[PDB]
Amino acid sequence: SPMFLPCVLVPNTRDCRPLTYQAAIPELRTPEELNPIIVTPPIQAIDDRPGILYSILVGTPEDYPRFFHMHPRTAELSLLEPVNRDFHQKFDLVIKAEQDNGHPLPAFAGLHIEILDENNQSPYFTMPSYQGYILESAPVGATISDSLNLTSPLRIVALDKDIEATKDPELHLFLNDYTSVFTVTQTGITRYLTLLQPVDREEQQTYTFSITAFDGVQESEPVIVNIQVMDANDNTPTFPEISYDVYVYTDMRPGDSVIQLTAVDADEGSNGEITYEILVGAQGDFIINKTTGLITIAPGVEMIVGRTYALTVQAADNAPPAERRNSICTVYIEVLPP
Ligand SMILES: [Ca+2]
Ligand SMILES: [Ca+2]
Ligand SMILES: [Ca+2]
Ligand SMILES: [Ca+2]
Ligand SMILES: [Ca+2]
């Protein structure tokens, strides 16, 4: 005698379509968070004070009394305990409505409850840290490499147990620093780092920062990244001045310090290693120390009063010839009397 609502007509007949009500419950969430359980459409039977009592007649699996209670007058559905989807994926219940006047003529309707999977696993990186390498002469857009050889790209793999293994988890990656220097690719299971701006080893040789993944709900633990900027020979050995006027004296004798030249090269290792050489002009009377740049009188040589000299001095770094850099200094020497 009571009918569940809505009554959806079965065309070409006088019959109401039997109802299967629908609810859905986020796995592992609590009653307090979820209650009351929203049912679509809302549960209601008709014939203030309806005089109708609602209850759950039967359901499968038979665990359901442990998880659900229905209010007799309101048909309100209350969760009693959080549901683990590993153990329970769904419930199918039958709802009874009957009159309370003492003449029950029960009606029945279905209620289907889905237990929903949720984004409830934090994303994660498959390494505890990442070491990258980049040459300072690399252009914008260059990919950071995973080795000194610079032959293969630094691979950053971010996964998420909420997503299928072979499927892209579509994570967002936050950098905590240097976001105007480096950027991370925005799609894919494997991410890479590229240059937004050229880097100069002589300004900064190392970059340390961390990356955090985000799945729309939870963040990963931050993962630490170090990037090493490798030297290019892009600095030239440089004297303080183009030329130097210096005077020597008749009394001076072989071995005596004539002048100390000092050039500067900011590059790393042998790229910054300077070698000095007199190309021409010493006329046998002066020599220079290959590594110190100090010029002195040559052995078995005496100054003559009038003599002048023009020494052409070269400073070069010890990069391979193809990349070698040098500059020239000219040293004018005149002998004087004390
Ligand atoms: Ca997740
Ligand atoms: Ca999940
Ligand atoms: Ca440089
Ligand atoms: Ca150099
Ligand atoms: Ca350099």
UniProtKB/Swiss-Prot annotation:
The record's note on quaternary structure and interaction partners says:
Antiparallel heterodimer with CDH23. Found in a complex with TMIE and LHFPL5. Interacts with LHFPL5/TMHS; this interaction is required for efficient localization to hair bundles. Interacts with MYO7A. Interacts with USH1G; this interaction may recruit USH1G to the plasma membrane. Interacts with TOMT. Isoforms CD1 and CD3 interact with TMC1 (via N-terminus) and TMC2 (via N-terminus).
Q: What is known of its domains?
A: Cadherin repeats 1 and 2 mediate calcium-dependent heterophilic interaction with CDH23.
Q: How is expression of this protein distributed across tissues?
A: Expressed in brain, lung, kidney, spleen and testis. Found also in the inner and outer synaptic layers, and the nerve fiber layer in adult and fetal retinas. Found in the supporting cells, outer sulcus cells and spiral ganglion of fetal cochlea. Expressed in cytotoxic tumor-derived T- and NK-cell lines as well as biopsies of nasal NK/T-cell lymphomas. Not detected in normal or in vitro activated peripheral blood cells, CD4 or CD8 lymphocytes or NK cells. Isoform 3 is expressed in brain, heart, cerebellum and kidney.
Gene source species: Homo sapiens
Q: Cadherin domain location, by residue? A: 17-125, 126-239, 240-338
**Which lineage ranks, top first, belong to the organism behind this chain?**
Eukaryota, Metazoa, Chordata, Craniata, Vertebrata
Query: Where does the source fall among the domains of life?
Result: Eukaryota
* Connected disease: Usher syndrome 1F: USH is a genetically heterogeneous condition characterized by the association of retinitis pigmentosa with sensorineural deafness. Age at onset and differences in auditory and vestibular function distinguish Usher syndrome type 1 (USH1), Usher syndrome type 2 (USH2) and Usher syndrome type 3 (USH3). USH1 is characterized by profound congenital sensorineural deafness, absent vestibular function and prepubertal onset of progressive retinitis pigmentosa leading to blindness. Usher syndrome 1D/F: A digenic recessive form of Usher syndrome, a genetically heterogeneous condition characterized by the association of retinitis pigmentosa with sensorineural deafness. Age at onset and differences in auditory and vestibular function distinguish Usher syndrome type 1 (USH1), Usher syndrome type 2 (USH2) and Usher syndrome type 3 (USH3). USH1 is characterized by profound congenital sensorineural deafness, absent vestibular function and prepubertal onset of progressive retinitis pigmentosa leading to blindness.
Name assigned to this protein: Protocadherin-15
Report residues carrying sugar chains: 149, 289
Q: Where in the cell is it found?
A: Cell membrane
Q: What function is annotated for this protein?
A: Calcium-dependent cell-adhesion protein. Essential for maintenance of normal retinal and cochlear function.
